[PDB]
Design a protein around this nucleic acid. Sequence first.
RNA 1: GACAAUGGUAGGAGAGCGUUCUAAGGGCGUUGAAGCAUGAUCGUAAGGACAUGUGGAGCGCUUAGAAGUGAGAAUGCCGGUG
RNA 2: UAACUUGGGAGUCAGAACAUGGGUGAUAAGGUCCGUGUUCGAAAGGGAAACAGCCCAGACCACCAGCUAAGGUCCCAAAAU
RNA 3: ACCGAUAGUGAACAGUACCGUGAGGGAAAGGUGAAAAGCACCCCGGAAGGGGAGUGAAAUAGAACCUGAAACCGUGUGCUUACAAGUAGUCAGAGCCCGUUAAUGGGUGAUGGCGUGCCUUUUGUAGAAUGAACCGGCGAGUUACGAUUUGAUGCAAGGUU
Lengths: 145, 111, 42, 155, 102, 49, 116
Amino acid sequence: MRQTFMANESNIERKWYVIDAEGQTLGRLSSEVASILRGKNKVTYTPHVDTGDYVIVINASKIEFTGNKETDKVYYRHSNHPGGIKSITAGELRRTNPERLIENSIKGMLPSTRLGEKQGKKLFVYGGAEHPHAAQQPENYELRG
Amino acid sequence: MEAKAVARTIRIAPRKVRLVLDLIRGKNAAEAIAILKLTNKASSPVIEKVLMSALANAEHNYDMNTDELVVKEAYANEGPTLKRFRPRAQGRASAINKRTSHITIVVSDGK
Amino acid sequence: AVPKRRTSKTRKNKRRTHFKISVPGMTECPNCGEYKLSHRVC
Amino acid sequence: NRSAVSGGGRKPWKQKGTGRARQGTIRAPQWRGGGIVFGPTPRSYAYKMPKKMRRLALRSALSFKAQENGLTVVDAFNFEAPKTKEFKNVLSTLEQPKKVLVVTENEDVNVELSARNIPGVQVTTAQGLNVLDITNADSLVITEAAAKKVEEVLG
Amino acid sequence: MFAIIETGGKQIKVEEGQEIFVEKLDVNEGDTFTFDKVLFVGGDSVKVGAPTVEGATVTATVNKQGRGKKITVFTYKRRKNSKRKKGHRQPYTKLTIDKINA
Amino acid sequence: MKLHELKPAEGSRKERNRVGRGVATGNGKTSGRGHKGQKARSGGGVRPG
Amino acid sequence: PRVKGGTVTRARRKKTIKLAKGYFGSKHTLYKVAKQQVMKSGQYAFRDRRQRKRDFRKLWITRINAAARQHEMSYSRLMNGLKKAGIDINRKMLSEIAISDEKAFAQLVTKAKDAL
RNA sequence: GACAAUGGUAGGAGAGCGUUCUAAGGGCGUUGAAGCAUGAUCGUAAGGACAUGUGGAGCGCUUAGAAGUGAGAAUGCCGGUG
RNA sequence: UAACUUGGGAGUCAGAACAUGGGUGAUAAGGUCCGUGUUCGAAAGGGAAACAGCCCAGACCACCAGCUAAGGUCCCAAAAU
RNA sequence: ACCGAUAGUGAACAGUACCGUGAGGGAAAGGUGAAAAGCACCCCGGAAGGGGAGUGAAAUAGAACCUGAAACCGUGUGCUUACAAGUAGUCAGAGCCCGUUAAUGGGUGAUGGCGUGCCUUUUGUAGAAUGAACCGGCGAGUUACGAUUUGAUGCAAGGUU
Ligand SMILES: [Mg+2]
Ligand SMILES: [Mg+2]
Ligand SMILES: [Mg+2]
Ligand SMILES: [Mg+2]
Ligand SMILES: [Mg+2]
Ligand SMILES: [Mg+2]
Ligand SMILES: [Mg+2]
Ligand SMILES: [Mg+2]
Ligand SMILES: [Mg+2]
Ligand SMILES: [Mg+2]
Ligand SMILES: [Mg+2]
Ligand SMILES: [Mg+2]
Ligand SMILES: [Mg+2]
Ligand SMILES: [Mg+2]
Ligand SMILES: [Mg+2]
Ligand SMILES: [Mg+2]
Ligand SMILES: [Mg+2]
Ligand SMILES: [Mg+2]
Ligand SMILES: [Mg+2]
Ligand SMILES: [Mg+2]
Ligand SMILES: [Mg+2]
Ligand SMILES: [Mg+2]
Ligand SMILES: [Mg+2]
Ligand SMILES: [Mg+2]
Ligand SMILES: [Mg+2]
Ligand SMILES: [Mg+2]
Ligand SMILES: [Mg+2]
Ligand SMILES: [Mg+2]
Ligand SMILES: [Mg+2]
Ligand SMILES: [Mg+2]
Ligand SMILES: [Mg+2]
Ligand SMILES: [Mg+2]
Ligand SMILES: [Mg+2]
Ligand SMILES: [Mg+2]
Ligand SMILES: [Mg+2]
Ligand SMILES: [Mg+2]
Ligand SMILES: [Mg+2]
Ligand SMILES: [Mg+2]
Ligand SMILES: [Mg+2]
Ligand SMILES: [Mg+2]
Ligand SMILES: [Mg+2]
Ligand SMILES: [Mg+2]
Ligand SMILES: [Zn+2]
């Protein structure tokens, strides 16, 4: 227990990033954003505290699929009532609620713990080009790819 | 600055007694007396006698003014249990516990 | 019909959270300087 | 044991159907008041050793006394009447430790009576010498005749 | 300034005046020890060993020779009537860094 | 010697083995008898020959 | 002679209960369930004394990877470059340098790039 | 000092811890024994101390000897209490 | 680096999967009976999501050191977007 | 080198109480203090029971009386807890509260990693196979006489009663 640094709330500095989903692939963008949200890009990464940064995604409606995912990829949910299975295609979900599509992709890439839930709450997704968080002064972030 | 009274081996169950003691704990003496007088429970007259005995001890043994006293402590401990039986059907006998309480009241002037 | 497991002290006390009585509704009587139940006569 | 305890003849309850453990008698060992399993039973603890070994033990004890300067020979004992104080004076003059074994040739009643009340002093005869007595003593006070007899019999 | 030293099969980041705990060294309390396996020197001027910085030594003073907190090593195998309990107290040498020589 | 310093000859005495006194002796529980069968029983085992 | 049960049983059981301090409810009170938990605690502690070394190496590697990506390099490339350059600074020290002295870590990265 | 070995059920072998009693020796105790309670103490383990509180009269240690000598489970027995 | 002989003391005589040579069954069975090898049994650790019997590999104890095995390196989740 | 109140007689105070038509079965239950000096008197209370005052070395020795463990039941509160999925711990770890047999301290614990009790019996049990409500006490390779083998010791063509 010699010398390993540990981040805590006193020394954690969380930045605000903005990422454009225009012409990006859903899964690849999502994995990169999940890394940023969890703080894996920080030298001070500490697993039991949230060292990540806030991420805004600003062109969710122009996110892109490959292959035939628009009609063939199906999102299923169950209401916990008998026969209460419902489904919607990825294309229909992009047409109706693209913010939900991107948000659910990223949160499915995040861990399912209390910390993971809070880190996922750090994500703000908007279908169109504008976002309401000018007061946080977000900085443009380019996807590494 | 404190006076105590204890009624030991009262033939009432401690759970039942604690129901009323919880009403009176921490209150001023007159308020506790009124609560006990108007509380419709079996334990209330017994607790009232304990509280009156404590206030009398405060006045007579420690030169305390009875109008400035608070029920600092009020509790019921378990006493010895009377073991009894009730005949049930098919010749069996089922246990009956007639429990008892040690009721303690401590009044204080706050000094 | 019968308990499958014994009830822990924690569970029993959690259940007893609401098992309590209330101080009765009482008001002061003017002449005698005592207390009585509201809407009752001495 | 369970056979010796009083009562306990009958089966306490039927083998099956009551929901209780099966039992055969209220005097079983797991029962309070039951019989004891094994436990002490009367017996002698004495055992024998070859006679040559007994003699070697006696000689070993006496030789340990003779070494370590724990042996002293008196000319004679002249006690005509039993007098504890006079025997204590004799022991003090001989400058002996607390634990002394007094050895006489035969049963000397006045010496025995004089010495038998002093704590730590014990009196024996030549034939009465034994390893426990000799080893327990710190010093042996032996008469010349007793010493000669001891030499004669232990060879 | 700081240094990376190699002692007790491990590496320690040290600065002057810092207390360090290392695997037991062959030395007595109050003596001066010298770490001669310096891997790296930071601070105002950076020396990068390959593997060691030639001529770099770190001097330290042995404050204490002690034994670590007792650890009860207990294991068992369920249903096999097999278990083992042992005690362990790991020796350590506590030193204070005096000076770092680049 | 002395009664407070007795010593048996070297190798002349060995402590008896006590079975059925816990796992760590290696003779707890089944007390060296293995598991089940006629030879595990009190009084068990066939006559010699 | 008869040997009564005496006090040894209570003393031993009390030792177990004291070890069970802070456990939930009956587990810090009753000897049987306390003994079971304490046995589990020992087994867990043995296993976790082993697993903690892996955990901390994992953490150091994550941090080194982040610092390398800051310097436009992957962890694997950086470690290969350091090995080729002959630098034997371990992962704990590398992560601690990356956290504390960014300039020294930059120098190390430059050496690794040169070796490659 | 330099080399090697040390997962383990049935089971074999070895070394020890602790309990009661006895012998001898040496000690403690109303200026407070045993027991009980608490503690952040010590030993590789079984386990051993110390301090404080309670308690109010017995009890350690060394060597050896002897055993009604160690419980978590037996739908175990008795008692107490959930 | 064992092997054998003589004595003291045992436990074992319900086995299982996998691979392979075969019988039986139906080139059925997580079937059954034999040969051969391994592992489990009596073996923790890493891999195969979880998963006695498969793959890697045999835990004296401690470390917040390093190199590898099977298996892996977009995120969950260490390492190649 | 027998027991010490679940032991030792079933019975330390009983072949009683209790059970059975009867033969018969058959318990539980010891300890104030050196001395009763066993609490005058006052106060609340119908009493019971208390608080004082006294006796006593001591009354939390006040008769349900030596010591007074555990289960279990309460009162107070230092830390913590109402978005969270759990064999309850363990490893990592801030924050808050304390300060020791002074030790690289104690209590609590946001949050992260790992993690299906024990025993028995089984090829194999988290097992939805067995057993245990909890705590405490009691509860299972013993002894005698022979045999054999090994260690020890004495003597030795002798050894031993
Ligand atoms: Mg009837
Ligand atoms: Mg009989
Ligand atoms: Mg074994
Ligand atoms: Mg067992
Ligand atoms: Mg069996
Ligand atoms: Mg069998
Ligand atoms: Mg068998
Ligand atoms: Mg039989
Ligand atoms: Mg006795
Ligand atoms: Mg016992
Ligand atoms: Mg490793
Ligand atoms: Mg090994
Ligand atoms: Mg072994
Ligand atoms: Mg053996
Ligand atoms: Mg032994
Ligand atoms: Mg011993
Ligand atoms: Mg016994
Ligand atoms: Mg039981
Ligand atoms: Mg088969
Ligand atoms: Mg087949
Ligand atoms: Mg085969
Ligand atoms: Mg088996
Ligand atoms: Mg395995
Ligand atoms: Mg094997
Ligand atoms: Mg599978
Ligand atoms: Mg796994
Ligand atoms: Mg296994
Ligand atoms: Mg490598
Ligand atoms: Mg990664
Ligand atoms: Mg008693
Ligand atoms: Mg009796
Ligand atoms: Mg007392
Ligand atoms: Mg008492
Ligand atoms: Mg909350
Ligand atoms: Mg939520
Ligand atoms: Mg888990
Ligand atoms: Mg089966
Ligand atoms: Mg279940
Ligand atoms: Mg069965
Ligand atoms: Mg059951
Ligand atoms: Mg029990
Ligand atoms: Mg036999
Ligand atoms: Zn009125």
